[PDB]
């Protein structure tokens, strides 16, 4: 479980690198969405 089961090769390196970049982009976007939703929440509380 601690590792994704893939045999080592240069292809594995490239694919894992792409998947890693993707994970960071998705994280960053979801963080941003959460920020906006928090703002709208607080705006409701203010009125």
């Amino acid at each position: 479980k601690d590792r994704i089961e893939i045999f080592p090769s240069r292809m594995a390196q490239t694919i894992m690198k792409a998947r890693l970049k993707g994970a960071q982009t998705g994280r960053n976007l979801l963080k941003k969405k959460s920020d906006a939703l928090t703002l709208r929440f607080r705006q409701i509380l203010k009125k």
Partner: protein
């Protein structure tokens, strides 16, 4: 002179007392006289790579030095023939031996030595003329389509001394004599050219006339020129006979350096039955082609030699004045052969174990193609095209073979990361797929089609667009949806050619134009905004399910049966259907 064998180590043979031989002079070995080529010299010792299994060879057997290096016979009758890598006329041998087994037949002339030929000398030649040679002095009439000609071997120039009249000759009869120096010289209808040399030319000309194939991927986003350099990840090969059928080519050369035996018998079987029929008179493709044959079991040296003799024939027919389209089944097999020989010689290998000079050899393989002004009195032009093949190994994108090929060829097509759909040959990887003939075909297309430029750019954009999004989508906006299903539609119907079917045997230009134009218009009429222009994707789907089925079934319009006018009228009618469906929303 005769030396004596000294050692045998697999397909290598170390012999003694062969001082004075060049390292690419040929040699006969043993009492069976197997063909060989030298590799390494040391003192009087020598090293001989053979072209035949070495079983039963005894040490000390005589070796006969032959004065010439490896060579390729040329002349009439080449077209409509099959050879092996060392130019072996297998048809003649099968007739002669009446057996399915290939003996050690090492005395068989590559060209027939008995069939006579209709020589028609040129009218302009004069006896005693001081033209100092040239190239053309004859035309052979023995072919329905491919008007073979007789040329003068290069590096031999001089004044006429005797010319034969028109008439039948056995191709060994001397038909031309040029003394010119106090020493008499005679010429037959057949010459000999070293395999590893390069035939000289007058001047290398550009390539602007386009080459049009039967594949939608190449015709669409990766244009290729007549006579250019291309690489095709063949993992399809029907493109060869498609070009022979449709493309504006004259001589077709195919080399199966390392083809699997079953599929090679397959090509040999199905290929001659195809018919061509330009002028309403059916004619077999076998006349406008010539084949080279090598299964995977043959000795490594033959696999090395096949890829070069193919190009030598291509350059001969380049000088012949016509246009040639050549393609190799798999360069990777040639690279593997080079690996094998290099490892056998006990040298120091480079990265991945490939010998270092792999790249240089691949460069030599290329740089022998393109439009060209030829050497000759009747100033004329010729072309050679080369379509190499790449077999992606487990290391699809890191093997040195793909690297070296990537650094030379002009147009490259690749497949993406290996999809679960193993039968998905028409894949395309945008990371390494490119073409550098975009500029040269602009001036050709501006007077035939100008609409496809924005369409192609939009196709590239949308493909990029889902390529960017699919990552996050695996881990929404209406435009995201519209684009995603549009891209999937493109990938499934515009691409994903079976190749073998009545509906993909060949796709002319107009069918591609209609397909992509309708697809992109369907994309545009929804992508603009939530509304029809500046609802949801589901309501579009439920309304236009039938239309979408028609979009997918566009591919089932056979060009061989249905006329072009019917099919384009159908495309236009379905366009009007889309317009009506979108306007009612």
């Amino acid at each position: 002179t005769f030396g004596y064998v000294h050692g045998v180590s697999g397909p290598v043979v170390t012999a003694c007392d062969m001082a004075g031989a060049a390292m690419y002079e040929l040699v006969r070995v043993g009492h069976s006289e197997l063909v060989g080529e030298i590799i390494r010299l040391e003192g009087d010792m020598a090293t001989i790579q053979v072209y035949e299994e070495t079983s039963g060879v005894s040490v000390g057997d005589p070796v006969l030095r032959t004065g010439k290096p490896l060579s390729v016979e040329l002349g009439p009758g080449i077209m409509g023939a099959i050879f092996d890598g060392i130019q072996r006329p297998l048809s003649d041998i099968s007739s002669q031996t009446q057996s399915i087994y290939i003996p050690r037949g090492v005395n068989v002339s590559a060209l027939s030595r008995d069939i006579k030929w209709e020589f028609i000398p040129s009218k302009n030649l004069r006896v005693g003329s001081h033209i100092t040679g040239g190239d053309i002095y004859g035309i052979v009439n023995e072919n329905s389509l491919i008007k073979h000609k007789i040329m003068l071997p290069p590096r031999n120039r001089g004044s006429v001394t005797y010319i034969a009249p028109p008439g039948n000759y056995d191709a060994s009869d001397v038909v031309l004599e040029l003394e010119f120096e106090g020493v008499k010289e005679k010429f037959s209808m057949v010459q000999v050219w070293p395999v590893r040399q390069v035939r000289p030319v007058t001047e290398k000309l550009p390539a602007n006339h386009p080459l049009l194939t039967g594949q939608r991927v190449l015709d669409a986003l990766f244009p290729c020129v007549q006579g250019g350099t291309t690489a095709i990840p063949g993992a399809k090969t029907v493109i060869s006979q498609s070009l022979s059928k449709y493309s504006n080519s004259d001589v077709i050369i195919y080399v199966g350096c390392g083809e699997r035996g079953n599929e090679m018998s397959e090509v040999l079987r199905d290929f001659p039955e195809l018919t061509m029929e330009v002028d309403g008179k059916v004619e077999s493709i076998m006349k406008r082609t010539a084949l080279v044959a090598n299964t995977s079991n043959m000795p490594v040296a033959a696999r090395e030699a096949s890829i070069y003799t193919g190009i030598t024939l291509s350059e001969y027919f380049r000088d012949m004045g016509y246009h040639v389209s050549m393609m190799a089944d798999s360069t990777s097999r040639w690279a593997e052969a080079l690996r094998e020989i290099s490892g056998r010689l006990a040298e120091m290998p480079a990265d991945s174990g490939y010998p270092a000079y792999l790249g240089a050899r691949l460069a030599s393989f290329y740089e022998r193609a393109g439009r060209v002004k030829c050497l000759g009195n009747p100033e004329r032009e010729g072309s050679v095209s080369i379509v190499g093949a790449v077999s992606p190994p487990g290391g699809d994108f890191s093997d040195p073979v793909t690297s070296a090929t990537l650094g030379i060829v002009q147009v490259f097509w690749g497949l993406d990361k290996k999809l679960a759909q193993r039968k998905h040959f028409p894949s395309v990887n945008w990371l390494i797929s490119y073409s550098k003939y975009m500029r040269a075909l602009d001036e050709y297309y501006d007077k035939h089609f100008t609409e496809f430029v924005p369409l192609r750019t939009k196709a590239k954009e949308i493909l990029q667009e889902e390529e960017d999004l699919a990552e996050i989508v695996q881990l929404l906006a209406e435009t995201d949806k519209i684009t995603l299903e549009v891209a999937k539609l493109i990938k499934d119907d515009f691409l994903q050619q079976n190749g073998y079917t009545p509906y993909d045997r060949f796709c002319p230009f107009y069918k591609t134009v209609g397909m992509l134009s309708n697809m992109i218009s369907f994309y545009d009429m929804a992508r603009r905004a939530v509304e029809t222009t500046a609802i949801t994707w589901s309501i579009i789907r439920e309304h236009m399910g039938e239309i979408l089925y028609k979009l997918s079934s566009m591919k089932f319009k056979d060009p061989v049966k249905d006329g072009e006018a019917k099919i384009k009228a159908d495309y236009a009618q379905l366009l009007e259907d889309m317009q009506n469906a979108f306007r009612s929303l």
